[PDB]
Design a protein around this motif. Structure first.
Motif, PDB file in Angstrom:
ATOM      1  N   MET E  22       0.789  -1.221   0.000  1.00  0.00           N
ATOM      2  CA  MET E  22       0.000   0.000   0.000  1.00  0.00           C
ATOM      3  C   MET E  22       0.829   1.283   0.000  1.00  0.00           C
ATOM      4  SD  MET E  22      -3.195  -1.353   2.277  1.00  0.00           S
ATOM      5  CE  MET E  22      -4.196  -2.656   1.563  1.00  0.00           C
ATOM      6  N   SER E  23       2.153   1.192  -0.074  1.00  0.00           N
ATOM      7  CA  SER E  23       2.965   2.393  -0.243  1.00  0.00           C
ATOM      8  C   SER E  23       2.877   2.896  -1.676  1.00  0.00           C
ATOM      9  CB  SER E  23       4.423   2.117   0.110  1.00  0.00           C
ATOM     10  OG  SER E  23       5.232   3.247  -0.178  1.00  0.00           O
ATOM     11  N   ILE E  25       0.820   3.667  -4.181  1.00  0.00           N
ATOM     12  CA  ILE E  25       0.243   3.043  -5.364  1.00  0.00           C
ATOM     13  C   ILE E  25       0.136   4.079  -6.461  1.00  0.00           C
ATOM     14  CG2 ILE E  25      -1.771   1.875  -6.347  1.00  0.00           C
ATOM     15  CD1 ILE E  25      -1.444   1.607  -2.688  1.00  0.00           C
ATOM     16  N   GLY E  44      -1.366   8.252   1.858  1.00  0.00           N
ATOM     17  CA  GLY E  44      -2.595   8.197   2.614  1.00  0.00           C
ATOM     18  C   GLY E  44      -3.021   9.543   3.143  1.00  0.00           C
ATOM     19  N   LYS E  45      -2.354  10.571   2.720  1.00  0.00           N
ATOM     20  CA  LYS E  45      -2.992  11.858   2.840  1.00  0.00           C
ATOM     21  C   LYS E  45      -3.231  12.419   1.443  1.00  0.00           C
ATOM     22  N   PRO E  46      -4.300  13.182   1.234  1.00  0.00           N
ATOM     23  CA  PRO E  46      -4.643  13.593  -0.134  1.00  0.00           C
ATOM     24  C   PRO E  46      -3.586  14.505  -0.729  1.00  0.00           C
TER      25      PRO E  46
END
Ligand code: HEC
Ligand code: HEC
Ligand code: HEM
Ligand code: HEM
Ligand code: HEM
Ligand code: HEM
Ligand code: FES
Lengths: 241, 379, 102, 81, 49, 379, 241, 81
Positions: E22-23, E25, E44-46
């Protein structure tokens, strides 16, 4: 960098130690939610189990519960329900989704208010003021259109249009509806929300106290009763010397 | 020991480490604490346990369960607060146990100290993880901070972050790893507890007066047991008094806000008791500097026994140092309120002031003082 | 102390206001004639319906032809059937007898 | 060895005491003890209190010192320029 | 085997291969004209880019 | 003890309960077991622990997590089986420890026995809950059975069911309650472990020959330690050998089937080691009868020391009883395979046969035998 | 009350101790799932991470992954998305739901096959037989229509219509497709499924063994070396008597 | 007391032993020990094995006894009636 104002502390039906809640206004303030806040802000966490504590008769709120719900139920036998049935059910959320929620309020995210009292600093007078206060933009200020100027808001501009005016509604009692009353009649409601046991839980307080004043002097007696000997000592040095 | 119910099972012979433990005559209530400490530990054990039952750690769900806990679970609300509201009390029970230490300077007992040292260091780390459990925002960022504080190690620092993380985020592993630790851990502490007691029963207790009391001792079972009986329950009162009437008073951490990974609260401070340590973090502009500053700051306690220079033990006969003793007290109490505030300059300087002040108090003044008294007192 | 005190810890275990919502109030449903099927579970699913909640089996019993009125069902049902039935154990042979199937 | 037996050597001390029933749990508790309050409450109070007083000042001192520093912008520069 | 086992222990807690999966993508990276904002999924931050 | 590193910390003086523990000369490998037991206990502790990290109990989700565990977690698969595959081995480590007990009849040591008793009883109950964790169907119904077996108590039985349940079902509370217990529990066992050892170090070890060996003893540190070193690792082999090549061999329980509350498997037997106990449940047509039959059945062990009638201890000099001893052995081993089968009359009778057979073996025959030997042997 | 038949034990590429899996057939058998079993029975538990173990090149299965997936992605910025992207994703389930699943197969519930090998007794030959066997209803028997008679099924009647015939498909290789081959080519696939580490994990087996034969005789030497003294004792009773 | 000192009283025993290096770890291990197998292997085997044999029969005995009981319905009653 706004000077953070603090609400003057008001008396309350519950304010004092043993001061209880009065459900009469609580019943009313519910309707407000039943009227107003069901617009956007939700409360997800309480079943219809309120019944008699908010004084609702078993039937009263059950039949009251019945109307609230009512969605689908026919997807190849896989469902939820119409018409909640039992009290376990929660409120329908006016928005399915923060995406659906925020866009509807256009960048604003209405919070769920369930515990929100315990969230914000400064108890209820925070909101009641925040309810009360709306001021006339000072000379030398402007706002985002939806944002409405109240110093109570931290940035002092809020997209919430003031809901409460005198007689927004009619109370269940038929009490004349008043901006302050309508406002103040709710302020007990959420105060109850985060702590249903609140009324009940105080019992133990008086329970323990008179229980408490019992034993300590009693203990305090016993202890000394033993120590009575030690502090009673004498010494004698009578050397054969 | 003819037909004594002590030796009949061999076990109860060990039980004679207590009944007949000799004891000093003049003893402040301030010696209740050692026994007082274990009390909290027990009462806790049950609370988080039955609480552990209905709660579950699942990164999405977990917090929700808690809501269920104080509400629909039988008496769920009284219980949560209990386990919590013991915690700070326990810590205030802690420092006092320490407090007695220097005021009578009993640390003369050597490795026993070091034991009492390590024993503590674990405990705070414990609830730290314990504080993550509620999964509040302040928990989340507070968690997020300190690991991000760790990374500054010059070469190897990096991996250890995402190693403890188990990823690039604060997510499941970070949490549910701990729900083991925050749980599994304290037992071993209890296991450790007895050890810390053993050594004391090498030499027997210390006194107020820095004077070997051996001329007079007392059978423990009748007496101090009683004063315990009193001293024990007293705690419960405020402990039970805070919890009901004004539950959230010390519940100053406000976040039942479901933690938003994106969103950040207007303010982040750890809970009340860290804060002075946390405050001292701010002081050094060097981020690495504050680290060797912060962690070492408590490690000083190990170093105290090195600096006892006097010819008499208990402070209560050395008036001068006593000033420093108190002088230090507020200095601690000072850093609190500074730590209790944001990072604006008037506080900053003030905060910047007491830091070096702090060490000087302990590290130099204290050893300096007693020397002269000897000379003053003709020693 | 303990009498109130220990109760509290203990009573936590005891029951919860959640499944306290069980003990069917509904029941209500449904089938027609055979089906059976005719179960669900809900560990139970007054009745009510009417009245009833005596039993027939688990999982939409729902009654013995609801005393000739409704049931679901109302005996006969599909293989084997509603009460007698048999439909006893995998699925034979003792059915719902007993005697009068009530 | 046996904890009490081999403790120390002591000579020619004498002790005098009564049953606890012989006496009361309040032998002039009020009357006798109330004076004692002072000799202890005066003893340390010389040595202890004053440092805190300094603190309390700083508490208000810096706060006040803080307060102006922000609270009023039209102070050092008034809203003129 | 001490070097087997002690190691095989530690590397467990280290990283989930799925967490590693999940790093970043987000590869993208073009999709977006010059100045014309596309979006992607960061750590995982926009991210606006 | 001049400058001996045993006394310098007082702690290591306790450590001289081992180094200098005297020991008997002639000792079967069969005395490795006592020490051998604790081995499994340790190695376990880690395994379920790191396993505990990625797993979560949530009635809907929980089982799913496990799938994640052996697959995407670093070496997740080796670990699950380990904690599991130790379990049965540990039990076979158990009975042997018992096994030595009677064959040399060392139970002469009195309360020590009773300790060894209770110590066990907890352990089996432990993994019982442990076996629920996988949330397989067989788990589910197996769980569902035994509580439903409990209820038969004439008056108060009812509530206790739904009390332990916490409802009318097998749901969350039933599960996640246990995930505490199945976890919290074994520690206390470890705590208990040392106690069971203490008593033995009252009297020192027993022998093969029923003869006080006091004429000869041995320093423990050099020797038996070695035989331990051997005896210890041997276990690991099969333990590590089973696990990799033929993992599911003893993995005879087949259900990774997500448990269907409605659906029932074609067969329900508990896992391998219960089964004889479970078998004996079937025997009594009275459902209550089997209960006082089943639970009591093991309680007999408490009762053995009452029946030692002989004038010499170790069986190995009484040939006759030895037959019974073995005669009993298969009788146990018998009930297995019967228990290993469904409820069908030829087995049923056979099962019905060995039941009363069983008691007679222990309860009457054994005490009966030795009397005559005395007379035979002129005692 | 059917006599429970047991499959004759077949040799296999993996059967023996050190016997490994061969991915060539595994690659093929995948297509079968990619063709057949995606009808009903799912496998939820494996990412596209297979790549090189089933020999798939990083691109090979990635681009292969790309085609497989899933719906939508436009619900007010919320949801999932098309075209999986990374390998973490799982397979689309042919049915959303057991209700949707069972009714579609009309009372039959197709199981997920992920671990199913470890579920059923008797390893793979269970299925391969169950694949193979379909018999002609004996005289004196009838079936539920969907149920098709095989003694391999426990009740010996199954709603699954025999999928496999000679050349149901064309293999990736181009190997001529054969009912038995097509059947037997899959039987390695699920055998791999429940234990991806299978191939890898065996390494330790040979690793530990030669490691193991080391120490025991070594230990066995040392022990004796000590015991060498004890078993060497002599005794002499030379009483002054 | 001190575990070894006060154990017992013993008189006029004598012991003889060597360094372990003086000898080998296999003093005719094979040759000497292999016979010993029997005297122990024969000793108990009289007393122990036979009970199991009975079991093993029962194992097949009852199974077989079981087997017919179900396996063939057209046995006691053939499919005629
Ligand atoms: C217009 C729909 C709507 C109405 C009607 C409404 N809320 Fe507001 N409310 C909002 C939105 C949207 C905001 C935030 C506006 C913004 O973020 O700029 C808000 C602001 C608030 C806030 C403060 C924002 C925060 O973060 O806490 C509270 C509390 C609140 N509403 C509760 C109430 C109460 C109490 C009432 C009845 C007086 C009410 N809502 C009626 C939608 C509504
Ligand atoms: C017709 C859609 C369909 C096809 C195509 C299909 N399955 Fe079947 N399968 C089912 C259904 C439905 C059942 C059970 C039928 C019943 O319950 O009566 C079943 C039976 C089975 C069973 C045994 C039932 C059980 O409980 O395990 C297995 C295993 C299985 N399928 C796997 C496969 C395999 C392997 C293939 C490729 C040869 C395949 N499915 C192709 C739907 C399908
Ligand atoms: C929860 C933690 C602790 C527990 C349960 C505990 C328990 C006890 C007990 C029962 C005593 C005997 C009574 C007493 O002297 O107080 C004691 C004494 C002592 N402990 Fe601990 N203690 C704890 C923490 C510590 C710490 C943190 C230290 C040092 C950093 C420490 C050092 C000492 C010392 C020096 C004494 C003897 C003090 C004296 O002679 O008055 N203890 N402790
Ligand atoms: C001195 C002893 C302990 C301390 C200081 C401690 C620390 C904490 C902390 C910081 C919290 C969260 C604070 C809060 O929720 O308000 C907490 C709650 C919790 N603690 Fe502990 N822990 C201790 C011992 C235990 C024990 C013995 C258990 C379990 C038996 C435990 C398990 C838990 C659990 C399960 C919770 C969840 C309740 C909740 O978070 O609201 N901890 N504890
Ligand atoms: C995991 C459980 C147990 C552990 C860790 C354990 C540990 C030990 C240890 C280390 C010994 C000393 C070596 C030995 O004599 O075997 C021992 C001895 C003994 N244990 Fe336990 N034991 C366990 C279970 C039991 C049980 C279940 C019983 C009785 C029901 C029992 C009764 C005894 C007895 C009688 C002895 C002395 C036997 C002899 O003299 O040869 N123990 N145990
Ligand atoms: C003699 C020691 C223990 C035994 C016999 C035991 C029993 C069990 C059992 C029966 C299972 C499920 C069997 C299986 O999953 O195949 C299991 C797994 C587990 N046990 Fe234990 N337990 C023991 C000690 C522990 C310890 C020390 C822990 C945690 C530190 C623990 C926690 C767990 C956990 C978390 C699992 C989940 C892994 C899984 O179920 O696959 N148990 N243990
Ligand atoms: S670390 Fe973010 S501001 Fe100091």
């Amino acid at each position: 960098s706004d000077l953070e104002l603090h609400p003057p502390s008001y008396p309350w039906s519950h304010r004092g130690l043993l001061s209880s809640l009065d459900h009469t206004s609580i019943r009313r303030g519910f309707q407000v939610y039943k009227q107003v806040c069901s617009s956007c802000h939700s409360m997800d966490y309480v079943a219809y189990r309120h019944l008699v504590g908010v004084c609702y008769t078993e039937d009263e709120a059950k039949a009251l519960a019945e109307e609230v719900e009512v969605q689908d139920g026919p997807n190849e036998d896989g469902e939820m329900f119409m018409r909640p049935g039992k009290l376990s059910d929660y409120f329908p959320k006016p928005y399915p989704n923060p995406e659906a929620a925020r866009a509807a309020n256009n960048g604003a995210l209405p919070p769920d208010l369930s515990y929100i009292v315990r969230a914000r600093h400064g108890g209820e007078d925070y909101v009641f003021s925040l309810l009360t206060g709306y001021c006339e933009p000072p000379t030398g200020v402007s706002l985002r259109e939806g944002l409405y100027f109240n110093p109570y808001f931290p940035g002092q501009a809020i997209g919430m249009a003031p809901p409460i005016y005198n007689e927004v509604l009619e109370f269940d009692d038929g009490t004349p509806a008043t901006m302050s009353q309508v406002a103040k009649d709710v302020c007990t409601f959420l105060r109850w929300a985060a702590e249903p046991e609140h009324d009940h839980r105080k019992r133990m307080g008086l329970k323990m106290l008179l229980m408490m004043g019992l034993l300590l002097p009693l203990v305090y007696a016993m202890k000394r009763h033993k120590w009575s000997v030690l502090k009673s000592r004498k010494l004698a040095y009578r050397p054969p010397k | 020991m003819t037909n004594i119910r002590k030796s009949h099972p061999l076990m109860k012979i060990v039980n004679n480490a207590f009944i007949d433990l000799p004891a000093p005559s003049n003893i402040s209530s301030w010696w209740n604490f050692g026994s007082l400490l274990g009390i909290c530990l027990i009462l806790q054990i049950l609370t988080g346990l039955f609480l552990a039952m209905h709660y579950t750690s699942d990164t999405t769900t977990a917090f929700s369960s808690v809501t269920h806990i104080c509400r629909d679970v039988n008496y769920g609300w009284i219980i949560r607060y209990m386990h919590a509201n013991g915690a700070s009390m326990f810590f205030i029970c802690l420092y006092m146990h320490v407090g007695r230490g220097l005021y009578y300077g009993s640390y003369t007992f050597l490795e026993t100290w070091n034991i009492g040292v390590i024993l503590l260091l674990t405990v705070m780390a414990t609830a730290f993880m314990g504080y993550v459990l509620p999964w509040g925002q302040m928990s989340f960022w507070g968690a997020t901070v300190i690991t991000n504080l760790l990374s500054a190690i010059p070469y190897i620092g990096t991996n250890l972050v995402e190693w403890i993380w188990g990823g690039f985020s604060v997510d499941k592993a970070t949490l549910t790893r701990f729900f083991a630790f925050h749980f599994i851990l304290p037992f071993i502490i209890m296991a450790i507890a007895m050890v810390h007691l053993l050594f004391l029963h090498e030499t027997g207790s210390n006194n107020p007066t820095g004077i070997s009391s051996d001329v007079d001792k007392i059978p423990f079972h009748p007496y101090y047991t009683i004063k315990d009986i009193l001293g024990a329950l007293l705690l419960i009162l405020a402990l039970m008094l805070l919890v009901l009437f004004a539950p959230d008073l010390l519940g100053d951490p406000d976040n039942y806000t479901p933690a938003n990974p994106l969103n950040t609260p207007p303010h982040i401070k750890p809970e009340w008791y860290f804060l002075f340590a946390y405050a001292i973090l701010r002081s050094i502009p060097n981020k690495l500097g504050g680290v060797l500053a912060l962690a070492f700051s408590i490690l000083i306690l190990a170093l105290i026994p090195l600096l006892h220079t006097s010819k008499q033990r208990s402070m209560m006969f050395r008036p001068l140092s006593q000033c420093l003793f108190w002088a230090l007290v507020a200095d601690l109490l000072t850093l609190t309120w500074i730590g209790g505030q944001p990072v604006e300059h008037p506080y900053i300087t003030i905060g910047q002031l007491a830091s070096v002040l702090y060490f000087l108090l302990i590290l130099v003044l204290m050893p300096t003082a007693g020397t002269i008294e000897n000379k003053l007192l003709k020693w | 102390a303990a009498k109130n005190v220990v109760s509290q810890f203990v009573s936590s275990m005891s029951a919860s206001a959640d499944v306290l919502a069980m003990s069917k109030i509904e029941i209500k449903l449904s089938d027609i004639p055979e089906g059976k099927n005719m179960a669900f579970k809900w560990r139970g699913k007054d009745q009510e319906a009417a009245v009833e909640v005596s039993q027939l089996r688990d999982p939409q019993h729902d009654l013995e032809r609801v005393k000739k009125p409704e049931w679901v069902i109302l005996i006969g049902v599909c293989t084997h059937l509603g009460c007698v039935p048999i439909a006893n154990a995998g699925d034979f042979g003792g059915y719902y007898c007993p005697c009068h199937g009530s | 060895g046996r904890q009490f037996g081999h403790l120390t050597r002591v000579r020619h001390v004498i002790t005098y005491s009564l049953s606890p029933f012989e006496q009361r749990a309040f032998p002039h508790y009020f009357s006798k003890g109330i004076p004692n309050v002072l000799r202890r409450t005066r003893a340390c109070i010389l040595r202890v209190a004053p440092p805190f007083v300094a603190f309390y000042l700083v508490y208000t001192w810096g706060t006040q010192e803080f307060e102006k520093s922000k609270r009023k912008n039209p102070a050092a520069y008034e809203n003129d320029r | 085997a001490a070097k087997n086992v002690v190691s095989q222990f530690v590397s467990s807690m280290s990283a989930s291969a799925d967490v590693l999966a999940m790093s970043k993508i987000e590869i993208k990276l073009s999709d977006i004209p010059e100045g014309k904002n596309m979006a992607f999924k960061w750590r995982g931050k926009p991210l606006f880019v």
